[PDB]
Design a protein around this ligand. Sequence first.
Ligand SMILES: NCCCC#Cc1cn([C@H]2C[C@H](O)[C@@H](COP(=O)(O)OP(=O)(O)OP(=O)(O)O)O2)c(=O)[nH]c1=O
Ligand SMILES: [Cl-]
Ligand SMILES: [Mg+2]
Ligand SMILES: [Mg+2]
Ligand SMILES: [Mg+2]
Ligand SMILES: [Mg+2]
Ligand SMILES: [Mg+2]
Ligand SMILES: [Mg+2]
Ligand SMILES: [Mg+2]
Ligand SMILES: [Mg+2]
Length: 539
Amino acid sequence: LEEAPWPPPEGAFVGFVLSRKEPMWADLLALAAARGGRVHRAPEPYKALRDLKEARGLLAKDLSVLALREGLGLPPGDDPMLLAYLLDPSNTTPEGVARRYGGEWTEEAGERAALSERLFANLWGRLEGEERLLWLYREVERPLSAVLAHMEATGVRLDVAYLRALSLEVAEEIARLEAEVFRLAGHPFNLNSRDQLERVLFDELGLPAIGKTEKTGKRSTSAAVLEALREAHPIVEKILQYRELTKLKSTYIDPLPDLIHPRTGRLHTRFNQTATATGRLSSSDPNLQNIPVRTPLGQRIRRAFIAEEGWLLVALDYSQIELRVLAHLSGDENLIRVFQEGRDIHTETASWMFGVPREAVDPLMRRAAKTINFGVLYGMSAHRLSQELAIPYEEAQAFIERYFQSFPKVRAWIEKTLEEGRRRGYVETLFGRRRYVPDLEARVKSVREAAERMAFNMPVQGTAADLMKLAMVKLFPRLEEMGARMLLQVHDELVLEAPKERAEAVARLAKEVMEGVYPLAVPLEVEVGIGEDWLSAKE
DNA sequence: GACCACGGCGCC
DNA sequence: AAAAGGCGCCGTGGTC
Ligand SMILES: NCCCC#Cc1cn([C@H]2C[C@H](O)[C@@H](COP(=O)(O)OP(=O)(O)OP(=O)(O)O)O2)c(=O)[nH]c1=O
Ligand SMILES: [Cl-]
Ligand SMILES: [Mg+2]
Ligand SMILES: [Mg+2]
Ligand SMILES: [Mg+2]
Ligand SMILES: [Mg+2]
Ligand SMILES: [Mg+2]
Ligand SMILES: [Mg+2]
Ligand SMILES: [Mg+2]
Ligand SMILES: [Mg+2]
């Protein structure tokens, strides 16, 4: 392309190079733009940003977040990555997308600008006639990228001092556990090494091996294996506790306080829009979609996520969402009726599991039942089921039989979905998001059946994903108008931050928007909590 | 120093 | 571990 002076005309595609992948932490090393057979290279990248009306091109959101960081209201526009992702969600990297749709991802801004331009042209052409994918792009993905940019640049507050204090207490407990483990082993070793631990458990103490690892076929020391061996030797329970504590310390307690951004004094994640096979978002650098909540220490960590002073967190979470979605997709009367009657399948399963009335079910019981309900729905084996429930194999089988016998049309929907997946080569969500699954026609049964579970899950999980995205796009402008902030999405949950005086009003509005987003054959219900911290917000 | 596969595990 | 699906990050062992 003919080189030309900065700035570019309106509608130009941008290319840019960052010192690191995370836009909140990156230095903008170079910036260029391409349009109408011209390439414009910016002599001063930061200053040049103010000349742009929007960020249009590959990874548009990243440039937008950096702009927002610098106090510039630069929104993201067209991004070929989003087009490619909609065509085929295995399109997840600019490297792959460039190669596939007409170019090469290099480390030069001008070349990236030019690449963005021609990729958009090509990919736009491919989405012609694809009216549903086009709808998703214009009505969901493109606007959502703006929403996500603001969320990333906003960040969330973290009680750093608290976490620092927590680290020392956890360190002392870890020392206590490991010392005990070493005594029981008769000698010290690296307890963080599963290879060393395998030798101690199965060769030195005698313990019977139960399972093997996938790629290298070592004797597994996973929690599932250790659970089965809890009553075989005292060292086992000690290892399980050590694992729990060290996992939380190494992954959350220690890293997170070090990631507070110096300017904002908050913690900033990345919400990746083209990262999953089903249409879910992912979160990275750091991942804020897997903050602990199940165990006591886990809850203490979640409490470190706090509202700004004078503000409150609002947490909203769709109730039994994939089950409701399944009701709609399958059209099963029995399942639809369950939700019309305001029933809770997680609580009911829980009451059965622990053998107590539905009123006796506590949160941890219900949560346990959640794993069981979705586990069974998406093809869990009776053997695994029996093992995790410590009930005979025969009982496990029976629960799985009643589960489906309760809801006749679910299996019917599955069969139809798989048949159609085999025919077209892909499956799709309610809104037409696609996932290609060639292995539905695999000649190896284990490979084929794995593919089948992926395939019939995707329309359900993906539809739920689409609904949340649509809800975020509708909700965002309403929140702006109320002076509230959208902070995090956790799959079927949103976390907002609102001034205390308005927090209740914001909660009510957000709930109604989420419930009214796209009516199904069953009501959508959203549970909402308000609190000074994320854990308190979830009640 | 950086990458990698792996086993493992946090969340949904 | 086992016929749940979907993610990203940890330390280890290893290479470069
Ligand atoms: N398993 C740990 C407990 C939390 C969980 C979960 C899981 C959630 N999911 C999917 C199905 C579920 O509808 C969706 C959102 O999860 P979540 O909000 O925790 O469950 P759901 O909304 O069904 O129940 P509630 O929100 O508690 O009413 O994510 C699974 O497929 N497997 C799961 O294990
Ligand atoms: Cl889980
Ligand atoms: Mg790719
Ligand atoms: Mg939910
Ligand atoms: Mg609205
Ligand atoms: Mg949830
Ligand atoms: Mg419909
Ligand atoms: Mg892995
Ligand atoms: Mg699982
Ligand atoms: Mg290892």
